[PDB]
Design a protein around this ligand. Structure first.
Ligand SMILES: COc1ccc(S(=O)(=O)N(CC(C)C)C[C@@H](O)[C@H](Cc2ccccc2)NC(=O)O[C@H]2[C@H]3CO[C@H]4OC[C@@H]2[C@H]4C3)cc1
Lengths: 99, 99
C-alpha cells in the first residue's frame, strides 16, 4: 500500500505471538519496541535519540510480521515511548520513500 | 525522486540562507534542526523522543527548501543530534511511503 503522511504511518505488527501497533519510521536505523516478552537470548545494548539515551535488549533473528509482510531481523526492546519499525526491517518489506 | 531505505534518507535543505543536510523522517511529527541562527521571533517549547526531552525554539512560517521543494512551516531548533524533516513539512512536498 501507499500511504500519505497527514497522519502517523502506523501499522499492525505481530511478533512473539502478540499484536501491536508500530510507526513506520524512516528516521530510525533500527527497530525499537516497548517492553514486551520475547523468547530467547538477548544482548545488552544502548542506543540514542533526541533526548538522550536508553538501555535496550537486542534480539537477533526475530520473526516479525509488519502489515502482513514477514521479516526476520534484529529487534531492540527497551523504554521507547512508541514502537518504531526502523530501516533494518523496512528494507526487508520493500518500503520506499517518494518525494 | 523515489528512495529505497538501505541508507539513511538524507537530503539537502536550505533555510535562512544556509545549506544543511537533513533526514526525511516519517517517524517525526515535527521538524527539528540542530542549533543554527534564524531571523525573527520564536516561542519556547519542549518536545520528546526516545531518550527523554529537549528544550527547543519554535519558529513559525519559516521558509525552507527541501531537496529542491519549497515549503513554509514550523521549524523547531534545539539540541537534536541530527537535523530531522518531520511530517509537517513532508506533506507539503508531497512525500509518500510505499510498503
Ligand atoms: C539506531 O537505532 C535507532 C532507532 C531509533 C532512534 S529515534 O527514535 O530516536 N529516532 C531517530 C531520529 C534521528 C531522532 C527516530 C524518529 O523517528 C523519532 C521516533 C519517535 C517518535 C515518538 C516518540 C519517540 C521517538 N521521532 C522523534 O523523536 O520525534 C519527536 C520530536 C519530533 O516531532 C514529534 O514526533 C515525535 C516526537 C515529537 C517531537 C534512534 C536510533
Amino acid at each position: 500500500p501507499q500511504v500519505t503522511l497527514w497522519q502517523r504511518p502506523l501499522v499492525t505488527i505481530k511478533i512473539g505471538g502478540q499484536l501491536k501497533e508500530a510507526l513506520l519510521d524512516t528516521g530510525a536505523d533500527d527497530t525499537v519496541l516497548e517492553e514486551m516478552s520475547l523468547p530467547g537470548r538477548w544482548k545488552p545494548k544502548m542506543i540514542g535519540g533526541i533526548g538522550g539515551f536508553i538501555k535496550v535488549r537486542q534480539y537477533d533473528q526475530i520473526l516479525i510480521e509488519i502489515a502482513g509482510h514477514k521479516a526476520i531481523g534484529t529487534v531492540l526492546v527497551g523504554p521507547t515511548p512508541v514502537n518504531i519499525i526502523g530501516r533494518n526491517l523496512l528494507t526487508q518489506i520493500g518500503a520506499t520513500l517518494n518525494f
